[PDB]
Coordinates of C-alpha atoms in Angstrom, one line a residue:
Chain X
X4 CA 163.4 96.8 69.6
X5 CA 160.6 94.2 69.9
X6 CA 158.5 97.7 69.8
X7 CA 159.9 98.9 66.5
X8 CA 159.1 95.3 64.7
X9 CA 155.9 94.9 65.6
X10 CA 155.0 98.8 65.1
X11 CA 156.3 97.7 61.2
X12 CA 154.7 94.7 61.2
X13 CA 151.5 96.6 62.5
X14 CA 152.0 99.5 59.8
X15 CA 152.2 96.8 56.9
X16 CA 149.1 95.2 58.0
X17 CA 147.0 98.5 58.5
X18 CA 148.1 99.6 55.2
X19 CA 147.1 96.6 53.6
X20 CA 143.8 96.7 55.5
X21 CA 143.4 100.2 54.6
X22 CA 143.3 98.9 50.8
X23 CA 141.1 96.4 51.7
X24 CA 138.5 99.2 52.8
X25 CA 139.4 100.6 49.8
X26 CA 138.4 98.0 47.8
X27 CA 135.5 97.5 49.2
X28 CA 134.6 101.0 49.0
X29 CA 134.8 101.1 45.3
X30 CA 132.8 97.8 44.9
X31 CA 130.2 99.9 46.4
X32 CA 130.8 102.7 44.3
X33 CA 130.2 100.6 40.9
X34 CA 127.5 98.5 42.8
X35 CA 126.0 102.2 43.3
X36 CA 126.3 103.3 39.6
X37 CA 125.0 100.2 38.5
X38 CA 122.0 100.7 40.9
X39 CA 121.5 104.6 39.5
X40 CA 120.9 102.5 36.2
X41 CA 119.0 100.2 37.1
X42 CA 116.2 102.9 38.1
X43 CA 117.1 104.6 34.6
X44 CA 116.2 102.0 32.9
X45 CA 113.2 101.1 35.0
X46 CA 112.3 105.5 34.8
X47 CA 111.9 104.5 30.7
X48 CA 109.9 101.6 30.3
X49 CA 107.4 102.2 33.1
X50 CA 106.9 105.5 31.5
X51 CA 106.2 103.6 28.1
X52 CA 103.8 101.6 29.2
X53 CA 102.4 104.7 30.9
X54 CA 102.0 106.5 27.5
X55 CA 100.6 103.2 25.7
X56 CA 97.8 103.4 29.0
X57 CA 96.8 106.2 27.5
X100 CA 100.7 108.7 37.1
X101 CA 104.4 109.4 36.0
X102 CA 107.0 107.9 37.4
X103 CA 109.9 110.3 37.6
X104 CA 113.1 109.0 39.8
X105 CA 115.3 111.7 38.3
X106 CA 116.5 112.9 41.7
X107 CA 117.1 109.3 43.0
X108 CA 119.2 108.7 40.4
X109 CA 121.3 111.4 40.5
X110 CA 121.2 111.2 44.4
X111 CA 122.9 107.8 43.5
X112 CA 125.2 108.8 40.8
X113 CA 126.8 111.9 43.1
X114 CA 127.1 109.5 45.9
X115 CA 129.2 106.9 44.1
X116 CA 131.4 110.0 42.7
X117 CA 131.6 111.0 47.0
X118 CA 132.7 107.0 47.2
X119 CA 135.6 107.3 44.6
X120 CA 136.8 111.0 45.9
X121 CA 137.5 108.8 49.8
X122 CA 138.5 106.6 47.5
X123 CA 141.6 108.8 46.7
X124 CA 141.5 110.8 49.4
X125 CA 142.3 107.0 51.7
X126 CA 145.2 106.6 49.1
X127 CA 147.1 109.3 49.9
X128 CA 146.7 108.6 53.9
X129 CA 147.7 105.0 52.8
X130 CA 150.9 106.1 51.3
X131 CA 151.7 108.5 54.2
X132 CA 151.1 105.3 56.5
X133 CA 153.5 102.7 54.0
X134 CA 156.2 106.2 54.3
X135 CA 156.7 105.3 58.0
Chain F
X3 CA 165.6 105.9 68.3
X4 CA 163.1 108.6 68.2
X5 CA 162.1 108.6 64.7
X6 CA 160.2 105.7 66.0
X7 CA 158.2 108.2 68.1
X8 CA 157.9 110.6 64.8
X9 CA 156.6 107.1 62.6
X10 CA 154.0 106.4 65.1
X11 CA 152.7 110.0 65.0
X12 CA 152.3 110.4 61.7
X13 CA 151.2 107.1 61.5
X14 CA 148.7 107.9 63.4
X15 CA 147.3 111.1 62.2
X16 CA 146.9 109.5 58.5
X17 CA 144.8 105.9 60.1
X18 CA 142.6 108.6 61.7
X19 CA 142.5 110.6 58.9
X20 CA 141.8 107.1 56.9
X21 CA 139.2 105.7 59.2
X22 CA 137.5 109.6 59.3
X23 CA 137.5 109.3 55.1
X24 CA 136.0 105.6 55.4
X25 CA 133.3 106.7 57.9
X26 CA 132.6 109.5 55.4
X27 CA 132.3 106.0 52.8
X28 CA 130.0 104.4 55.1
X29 CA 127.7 107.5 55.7
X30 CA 127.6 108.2 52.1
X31 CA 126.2 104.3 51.7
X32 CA 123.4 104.9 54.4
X33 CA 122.2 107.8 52.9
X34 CA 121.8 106.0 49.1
X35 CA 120.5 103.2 50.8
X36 CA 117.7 105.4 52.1
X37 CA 117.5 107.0 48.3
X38 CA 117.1 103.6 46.6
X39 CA 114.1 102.7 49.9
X40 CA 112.8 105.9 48.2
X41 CA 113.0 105.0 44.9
X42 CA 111.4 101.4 45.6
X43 CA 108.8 102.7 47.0
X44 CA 107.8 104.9 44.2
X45 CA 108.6 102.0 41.8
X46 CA 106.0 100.2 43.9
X47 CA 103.3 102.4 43.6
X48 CA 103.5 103.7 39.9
X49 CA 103.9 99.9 39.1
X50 CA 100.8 98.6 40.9
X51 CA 98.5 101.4 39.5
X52 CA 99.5 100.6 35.8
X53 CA 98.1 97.3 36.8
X100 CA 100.7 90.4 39.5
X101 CA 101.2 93.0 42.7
X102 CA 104.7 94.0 42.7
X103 CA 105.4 94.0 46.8
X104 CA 108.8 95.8 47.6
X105 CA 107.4 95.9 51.4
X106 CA 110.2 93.6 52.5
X107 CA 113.4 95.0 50.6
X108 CA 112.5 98.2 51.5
X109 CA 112.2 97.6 55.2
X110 CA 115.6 95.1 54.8
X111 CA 116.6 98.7 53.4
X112 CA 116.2 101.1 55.9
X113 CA 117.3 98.5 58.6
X114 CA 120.8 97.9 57.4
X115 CA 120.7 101.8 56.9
X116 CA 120.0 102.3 60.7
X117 CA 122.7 99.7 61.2
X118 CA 125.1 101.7 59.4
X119 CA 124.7 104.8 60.8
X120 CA 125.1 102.8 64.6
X121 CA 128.4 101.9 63.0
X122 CA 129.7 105.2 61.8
X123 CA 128.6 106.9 65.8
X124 CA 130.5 103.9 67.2
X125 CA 133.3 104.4 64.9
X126 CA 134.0 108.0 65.9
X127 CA 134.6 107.5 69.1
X128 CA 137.8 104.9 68.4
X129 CA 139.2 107.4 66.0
X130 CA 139.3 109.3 68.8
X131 CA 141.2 107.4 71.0
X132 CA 143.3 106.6 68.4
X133 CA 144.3 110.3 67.9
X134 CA 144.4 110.6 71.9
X135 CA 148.2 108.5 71.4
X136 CA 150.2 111.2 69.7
X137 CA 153.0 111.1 72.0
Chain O
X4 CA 157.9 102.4 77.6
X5 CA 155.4 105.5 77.4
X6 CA 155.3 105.3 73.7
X7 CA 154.2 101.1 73.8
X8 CA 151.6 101.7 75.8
X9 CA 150.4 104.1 73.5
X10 CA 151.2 101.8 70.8
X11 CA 148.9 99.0 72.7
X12 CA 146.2 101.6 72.9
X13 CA 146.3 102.2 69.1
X14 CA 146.7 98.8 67.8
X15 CA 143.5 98.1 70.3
X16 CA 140.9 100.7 68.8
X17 CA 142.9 100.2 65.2
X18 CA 141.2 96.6 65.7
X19 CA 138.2 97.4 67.1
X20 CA 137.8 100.1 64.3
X21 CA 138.3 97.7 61.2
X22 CA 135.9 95.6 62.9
X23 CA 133.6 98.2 63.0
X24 CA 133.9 98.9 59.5
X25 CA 134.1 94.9 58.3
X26 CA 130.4 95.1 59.5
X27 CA 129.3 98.0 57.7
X28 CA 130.7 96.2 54.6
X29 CA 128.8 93.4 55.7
X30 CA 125.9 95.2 56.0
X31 CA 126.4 96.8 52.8
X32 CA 127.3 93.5 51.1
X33 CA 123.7 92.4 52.1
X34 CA 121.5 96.1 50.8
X35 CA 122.8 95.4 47.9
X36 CA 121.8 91.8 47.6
X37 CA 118.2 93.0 48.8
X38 CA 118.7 95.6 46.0
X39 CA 119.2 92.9 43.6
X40 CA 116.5 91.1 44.4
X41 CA 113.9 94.0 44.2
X42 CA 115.2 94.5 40.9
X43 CA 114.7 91.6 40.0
X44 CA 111.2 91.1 41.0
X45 CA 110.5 94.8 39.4
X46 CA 111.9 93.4 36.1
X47 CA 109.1 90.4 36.3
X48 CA 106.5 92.5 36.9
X49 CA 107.6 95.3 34.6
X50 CA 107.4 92.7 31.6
X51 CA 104.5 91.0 32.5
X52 CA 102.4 94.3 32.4
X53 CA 103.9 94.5 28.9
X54 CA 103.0 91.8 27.6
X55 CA 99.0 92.7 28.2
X101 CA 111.2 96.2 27.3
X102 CA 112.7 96.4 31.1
X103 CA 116.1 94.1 31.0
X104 CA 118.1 94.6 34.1
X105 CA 119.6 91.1 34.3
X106 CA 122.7 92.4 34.1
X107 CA 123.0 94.7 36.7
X108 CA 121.0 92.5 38.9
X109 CA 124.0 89.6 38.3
X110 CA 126.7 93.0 38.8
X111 CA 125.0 93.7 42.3
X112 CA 124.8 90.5 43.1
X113 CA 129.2 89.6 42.1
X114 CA 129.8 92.9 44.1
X115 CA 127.8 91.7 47.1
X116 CA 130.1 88.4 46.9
X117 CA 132.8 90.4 46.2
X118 CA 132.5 92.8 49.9
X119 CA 131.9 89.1 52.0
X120 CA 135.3 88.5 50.5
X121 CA 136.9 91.3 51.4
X122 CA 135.5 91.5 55.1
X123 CA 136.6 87.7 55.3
X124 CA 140.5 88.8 54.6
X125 CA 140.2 91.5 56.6
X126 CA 139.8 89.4 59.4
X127 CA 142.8 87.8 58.7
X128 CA 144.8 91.3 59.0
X129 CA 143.0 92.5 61.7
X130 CA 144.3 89.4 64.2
X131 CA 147.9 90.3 62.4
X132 CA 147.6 93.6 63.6
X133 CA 146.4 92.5 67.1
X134 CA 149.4 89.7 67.5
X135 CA 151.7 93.0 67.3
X136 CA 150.6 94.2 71.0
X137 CA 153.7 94.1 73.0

C-alpha cells in the first residue's frame, strides 16, 4: 500500500500543478489581450499624426491574430479543467 | 485492489490529455509572439518615416528567440506525453 | 509490482514534463517583459513626434505584473514538481 499513497499523494500534486499551468496560462491570455490593445491604441494615434503629415500603418490582422489567440488560451483553459477534475476523481 | 490499476489509467489518459492541451497553450504563445515581432516591426518602420529613431531591433530579435525556444519545448514535450501514455497497464 | 514500475515511469516524464513546461512559462514570462519594454519605448517616441495622444502606461505596468506573476508560478511549481518526484517507490 505504500504504492496506493504515494500514487494519491502524486495525484494531489499533479492536480494542483495542473492549475498552476493553468494559471499561468490565463496570465498569458490577459497579458495577450492587453498586448492586442496596446497595438490598437498605437494603430490610432500613429495614424493621426499620419493625417496631420498631410505610409499607413494598419496592424488590423496582428491584432486580431492576438485577440483569437488569447480566446485559443482560455478554451485549454477549460478544456485542462475538465482533465483536472477527471485527475482529482481518482 | 485493482481499482488502483483503473485510477492510474485514467489518471493517466487525462495528464496526457492535460499536458497535450498545455502544449497546444504553449504553441498558441509562439505563434503570437511571432505576430507581435511582426507587428513591431511595422511599428518600427511607419514610426521612423513620420519622423528620436525608434529601434525595436533588439525586442524583436529577444522575440523570435524565446519563440524558437518555445517551439524546442513543445517538440521535447511530445515525446514525454508519450511515454507517459506508454504506462496504461 | 508491474503496475509501480509503471507508476515510476509516469511520475518520471510527469516531472520532466512540468519542467518542460515551467520553462516555456519562463520563457513567456520574459516576451512579455521584452513586450513591455518595446511598448514603452514606442509610447516615447509616439509622443515626442506629437509634440512637433499614445498612453499605454497601463498596459505596459499589466504586462509587466503578469510577467512577475508567471516567475511566481513556475517558482511553486517547482515546489510540486519535487512533491511529485518524492512519490517514486
Amino acid at each position: 500500500k505504500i504504492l496506493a499513497a504515494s500514487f494519491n499523494k502524486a495525484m494531489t500534486n499533479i492536480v494542483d500543478a495542473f492549475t498552476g499551468v493553468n494559471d499561468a496560462i490565463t496570465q498569458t491570455s490577459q497579458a495577450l489581450q492587453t498586448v492586442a490593445t496596446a497595438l490598437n491604441k498605437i494603430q490610432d494615434v500613429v495614424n493621426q499624426q499620419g493625417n496631420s503629415l498631410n505610409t499607413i500603418l494598419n496592424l488590423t490582422s496582428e491584432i486580431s491574430t492576438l485577440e483569437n489567440k488569447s480566446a485559443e488560451l482560455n478554451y485549454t483553459v477549460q478544456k485542462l479543467q475538465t482533465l483536472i477534475d477527471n485527475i482529482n476523481s481518482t
